[PDB]
Design a protein around this ligand. Structure first.
Ligand SMILES: CCNC(=O)CN(CC)c1ccnc(C)n1
Lengths: 237, 300
């Protein structure tokens, strides 16, 4: 069935699974036309596919050429996502495919189910969690590779950098969701927090700064402050 | 005009003949049903006074033999049987008619309801859905399951309807996943019509037979089958114009005939609202939509 608070620890067992988020597959700017009407201009997007146990991010870039001459693009984006996820499973050795795939929006269930009819032993699940993965385009290096793409492309990241050397997957996932929740709630402040100390750098091969354990605990505390705060400023409390 | 004689009526029962029904009291002198129009299939069905559980009955065609009903006190039901001795049969029927112990199939001459509900239903196809080839008639009841239901447990007593599944490899061509899922014309026209049913009459025939088993027996698998065959058409952008026009006639008479008070269990809100209001054919079922909206607007 669905994924929720009660079975949250299944994400870090030893059955290979992915999360698929489709919220940045079809992205547009909305502008006025000379005639004073409105038109959209698509920009590159990405499929956020994430192995939560290892941190593997199989980032599929969706080049704008894929929408050319297509109608009903919000609907096709769902099927395009399913088609690419399916292509990835199929590319992979049997022992390497996902036993489950969790979709972050229910509208993905039917597209992915239909694209995966060949894999009846892969379970396609929704979740009741409000995961902040839409904020993945606030990670500068991810946004950069998407926007520079001139063609369809798959780039493989580890969204945990080297964190699993020191902390568990459970803890690494929780750090990631907190960072992403913060970026989603107030991207400027979130980013001020992460880069306030020029001595702490992001290695060329990482997404996040090289914080010590003690420095992560402070960062993590500052991000919770941010999220609590924006909640007041928003609701007046 | 043909006759189904009854040996006796030892237990109080509600008897159905097509869309008609009447009460027989325990050991009332009842010897069967006469003036049955030749040329259509028919269904004679039963609901015991004592156990309104398990409606049950027999599909049959009087051209295919002489059939009578006889209560079995061992198995506890009204059983259809064939009389092979034809002189015995004529003689038995003549006596019962002379003594006027038969009710008359009560057809009004303006009334084409039964013909309109059974236009494409053929006894030879009923016998492939309901497998029991030693009899020419076919038993159905409330609790029989469908072949598809057994895939999701006794196969001899199953309803072998045509399996329809929108999320199956049969329904979806590789590379046309979105196209085939959002527009089922390929599944309808090539897979089902051209491939399985051969023509639209065989398809409509199963669809009608599914609806009747749902109405008369509350057979839940039959109901699912009816709705599925409707939805497959309604979810195809490309349907021959003649098929839509007959579909509209077919549904109209099914909706007209449904008990007003059974509407909540035999009609799937999702399928009907989708078919009448969201589907490719939302503009194509004028008669069906008008009767649906004037009779069951609650459902919509
Ligand atoms: C795609 C679902 N499979 C995995 O996640 C397994 N996972 C092992 C760490 C990796 C890592 C690298 N490449 C691939 C392809 N898989």
């Amino acid at each position: 069935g669905a994924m929720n608070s009660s079975n949250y620890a299944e994400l870090f067992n030893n059955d290979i699974k992915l999360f698929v988020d489709d919220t940045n597959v079809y992205r547009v700017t909305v502008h006025k036309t000379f005639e004073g009407n409105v038109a959209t201009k698509a920009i590159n997007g990405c499929i956020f596919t994430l192995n939560p146990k290892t941190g593997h991010l199989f980032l599929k870039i969706i080049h704008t050429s894929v929408w050319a001459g297509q109608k009903r693009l919000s609907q096709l984006a769902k099927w395009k996502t399913a088609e690419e996820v399916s292509a990835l499973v199929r590319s992979l050795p049997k022992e390497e495919q996902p036993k489950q795939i969790i979709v972050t929006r229910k509208a993905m269930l039917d597209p992915l189910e239909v694209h995966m009819l060949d894999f009846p032993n892969i379970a396609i699940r929704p979740t009741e969690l409000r995961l902040p993965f839409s904020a993945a385009m606030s990670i500068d290096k991810l946004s950069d590779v998407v926007m520079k793409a001139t063609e369809p492309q798959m780039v493989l990241f580890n969204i945990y950098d080297d964190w699993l050397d020191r902390i568990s997957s459970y803890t690494a996932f929780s750090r990631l969701t907190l960072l992403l929740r913060a970026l989603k709630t107030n991207e400027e402040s979130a980013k001020m927090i992460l880069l306030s100390d020029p001595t702490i750098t992001i290695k060329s091969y990482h997404l996040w700064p090289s914080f010590t354990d003690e420095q992560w605990i402070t960062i993590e505390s500052q991000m919770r402050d941010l999220i609590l705060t924006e909640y007041g400023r928003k609701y007046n409390v | 005009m043909n006759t189904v004689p009854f040996t006796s009526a030892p237990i109080e029962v509600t008897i159905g003949i097509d869309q008609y029904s009447f009460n027989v009291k325990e050991n009332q002198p009842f010897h069967g049903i006469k003036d049955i129009p030749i040329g259509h299939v028919h269904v004679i069905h039963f609901q015991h006074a004592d156990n309104s559980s398990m409606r049950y009955g027999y599909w049959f065609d009087c051209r295919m033999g002489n059939f009578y009903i006889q209560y079995d006190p061992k198995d506890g039901l009204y059983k259809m049987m064939e009389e092979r001795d034809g002189a015995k049969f004529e003689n038995i029927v003549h006596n019962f008619k002379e003594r006027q112990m038969m009710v008359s199939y009560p057809k009004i001459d303006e009334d084409d309801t039964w013909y309109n509900l059974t236009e494409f239903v053929q006894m030879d196809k009923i016998r492939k859905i309901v497998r029991k080839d030693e009899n020419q008639f076919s038993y159905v009841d409330s609790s029989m399951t469908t072949v598809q239901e057994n895939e999701l447990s006794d196969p001899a007593h199953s309803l072998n309807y045509t399996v329809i599944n929108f999320k199956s490899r049969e329904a979806i061509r590789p590379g046309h996943e979105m196209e085939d899922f959002l527009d089922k014309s390929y599944y309808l026209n090539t897979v089902m019509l051209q491939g399985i049913f051969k023509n639209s009459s065989n398809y409509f025939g199963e669809l009608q037979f599914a609806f009747l088993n749902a109405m008369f027996f509350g057979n839940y698998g039959s109901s699912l089958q009816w709705h599925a065959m409707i939805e497959l058409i309604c979810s195809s952008a490309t349907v021959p114009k003649h098929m839509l026009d007959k579909l509209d006639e077919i549904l109209y008479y099914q909706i007209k005939t449904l008990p007003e008070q059974y509407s909540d269990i035999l009609l799937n809100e999702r399928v009907w609202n989708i078919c009448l209001y969201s589907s490719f054919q939302k503009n194509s079922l004028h008669n069906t939509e008008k009767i649906m909206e004037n009779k069951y607007p609650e459902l919509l």
